[PDB]
């Protein structure tokens, strides 16, 4: 699973 | 589909001296073909946070300004002293990105396995990129 670092 | 591919190589990668949540950051890359919309990828040789403190983190993210939300799938793996791809790890699908909008995975490779020359994946100390896009 990705993820980010921002909204 | 857009498809485009870049390689990216981090030289003296042992020596990098960025602390937690620190980024070394790649040349701007291009989707080329209609938009150009343009491209950078982000590594954290010592992680993002305390979650990831033993881990590279590696993310993908659109620098430029499109004219909608941009849908892309990706890869990204690492080039070994053979020049064959592992350790792998893909977007199970496309993630949607405005510009400034980052995807990838906090824990990409434990760094411990990664610096083990045992493993191949530092040849000369250097850590080779192979990140691959589909713009959907």
Known sequence: ?7 | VVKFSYMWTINNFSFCREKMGEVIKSSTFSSGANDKLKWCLRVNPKGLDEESKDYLSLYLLLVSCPKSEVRAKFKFSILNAKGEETKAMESQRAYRFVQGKDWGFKKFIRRDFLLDEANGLLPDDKLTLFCEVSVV
Do not use: N
Not at chain 1, 1 to 7: L, M, Q, R, S, Y
């Open chain 1, 1 to 7: 699973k990705a993820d980010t670092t921002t909204p």
